[PDB]
DNA sequence: GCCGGTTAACCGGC
DNA sequence: GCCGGTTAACCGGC
């Protein structure tokens, strides 16, 4: 991780911060931290984007584009869909998309950090975030390994807890941990809530022992049996209660 | 619908609103239908104020006085217990955005509201599985004519600072062919249509409706598990061992 | 403690 | 046309 090593700084600067009254916009607090103390490295994902294509003028069409991002496994991640890319250009630039894979990106010398801010009141019941698709996540897995692309991009969560404080929202902690150092067969899918891994990055265990493959081929391994297991549910939960109303 | 009779007042107010880049829905509602038209939570508040002689929220669940709409509408049991005058319930989550409650009958209404210059996206109405359970209750309370559930869908594109609605449109969930409904599984398991594309050619009893969606609720909930196989771990075996 | 369903719409494949 | 996956977190049952 780029963060990491001024992540301590991070956790103090952001810790008293203030937004007008939910939490979302303390992700742009994030983004303006980073961009004052790693500069070079940091980016939106749409102006990762838009700084791709503007260097390639030449470079038209959505086929040609995508040949820009040189992986398949990030041009997964990070790309927008055909039509987006083909009619891009300097006068209609990529502006910030709902869906999205990561909030900002770290790069230097072509290794990527994906970074996805998770904002969290923490006056409220406790109820774990969507943190992303468990399906998008085995779909990088796959193409990871098809491609063996197992040192070029690492997955990263910080989370902003706040509480409303009079008339602003205020930051009281944060918390940071990667993805792939997380045991996989411990991460929770919640197949109703759009199918998202959820946890608090705070609860994030972090002690991995493998390669980045392992990892990759063990959360395969349990997506596919979370799924077989959610297939069975289905019948126990959707079908089998209200079967008495209709037979 | 209390709305539809008057849908025509609705929809020449708003055709040419502007928003700053639509609850102006509620405003207009609550200033042509005063006594009827609330927010949810204001019902909520409204509901407890006036029986102040009532507490806890075994108590007050009953002053919904029947099971489904408490199901429908009730906030959660601590959040009930601990409302007070000075402790009133805000905007939430919630399942409808505005109430028309006249004679002892409800209209729930969700406004959906739509970016009409982007490709057409049919977003989520209402969960499936939420449905399932009314239905349900519907069923076992006999409560058959008591609510309906309605959409306003306001059309809008962006025009200088600020958002337009260049349209509307109004439709009845309980006037669809409950077989044409759209269950998005992934998508929270809700079902998904634009207000001007829902058929409302239903021509049965309410009670018929609610067998018939109980009976395609459950039909689609085990396509969806087949369809699990197939999309979440078919296409992943390869890789593992 | 443990658990998982719901709201807002929204992009783009073939 | 037809089809369906993703982002934002968030609430309250035993
Ligand atoms: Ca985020
Ligand atoms: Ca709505
Ligand atoms: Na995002
Ligand atoms: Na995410
Ligand atoms: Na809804």
């Given at each position: 991780?780029?963060?990491?090593?001024?992540?301590?700084?991070?956790?103090?600067?952001?810790?008293?911060?203030?937004?007008?009254?939910?939490?979302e916009?303390?992700?742009?607090?994030?983004?303006?931290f980073?961009?004052?103390?790693?500069?070079?490295?940091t980016?939106?994902?749409?102006?990762?984007?838009?700084?791709?294509?503007?260097?390639?003028?030449?470079?038209?069409?959505?086929?040609?584009?995508?040949?820009?991002?040189?992986?398949?496994?990030?041009?997964?991640?990070?790309?927008?869909?055909?039509?987006?890319?083909?009619?891009?250009?300097?006068?209609?630039?990529?502006?910030?998309?709902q869906?999205?894979?990561?909030?900002?990106?770290?790069?230097?010398?072509?290794?990527?950090?994906?970074?996805?801010?998770?904002?969290?009141?923490?006056?409220?019941?406790?109820?774990?975030?969507?943190?992303?698709?468990?399906?998008?996540?085995?779909?990088?897995?796959?193409?990871?390994?098809?491609?063996?692309?197992?040192?070029?991009?690492?997955?990263?969560?910080?989370?902003?807890?706040?509480?409303?404080?009079?008339?602003?929202?205020?930051?009281?902690?944060?918390?940071?941990?990667?993805?792939?150092?997380?045991?996989?067969?411990?991460?929770?899918?919640?197949?109703?809530?759009?199918?998202?891994?959820?946890?608090?990055?705070?609860?994030?265990?972090?002690?991995?022992?493998?390669?980045?493959?392992?990892?990759?081929?063990?959360?395969?391994?349990?997506?596919?049996?979370?799924?077989?297991?959610?297939?069975?549910?289905?019948?126990d939960?959707?079908?089998?209660?209200?079967?008495?109303?209709?037979?």
């Open positions: 991780s780029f963060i990491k090593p001024i992540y301590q700084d991070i956790n103090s600067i952001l810790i008293g911060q203030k937004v007008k009254r939910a939490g916009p303390f992700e742009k607090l994030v983004y303006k980073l961009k004052e103390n790693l500069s070079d490295l980016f939106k994902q749409y102006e990762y984007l838009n700084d791709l294509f503007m260097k390639n003028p030449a470079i038209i069409g959505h086929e040609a584009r995508y040949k820009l991002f040189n992986s398949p496994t990030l041009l997964f991640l990070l790309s927008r869909g055909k039509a987006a890319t083909e009619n891009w250009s300097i006068e209609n630039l990529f502006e910030e998309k869906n999205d894979t990561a909030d900002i990106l770290l790069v230097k010398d072509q290794f990527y950090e994906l970074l996805d801010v998770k904002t969290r009141n923490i006056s409220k019941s406790a109820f774990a975030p969507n943190i992303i698709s468990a399906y998008k996540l085995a779909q990088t897995c796959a193409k990871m390994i098809d491609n063996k692309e197992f040192d070029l991009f690492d997955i990263n969560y910080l989370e902003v807890d706040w509480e409303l404080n009079g008339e602003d929202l205020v930051c009281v902690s944060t918390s940071f941990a990667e993805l792939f150092k997380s045991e996989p067969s411990e991460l929770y899918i919640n197949w109703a809530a759009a199918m998202q891994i959820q946890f608090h990055v705070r609860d994030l265990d972090q002690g991995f022992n493998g390669t980045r493959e392992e990892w990759a081929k063990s959360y395969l391994k349990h997506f596919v049996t979370q799924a077989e297991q959610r297939a069975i549910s289905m019948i939960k959707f079908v089998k209660p209200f079967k008495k109303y209709i037979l």
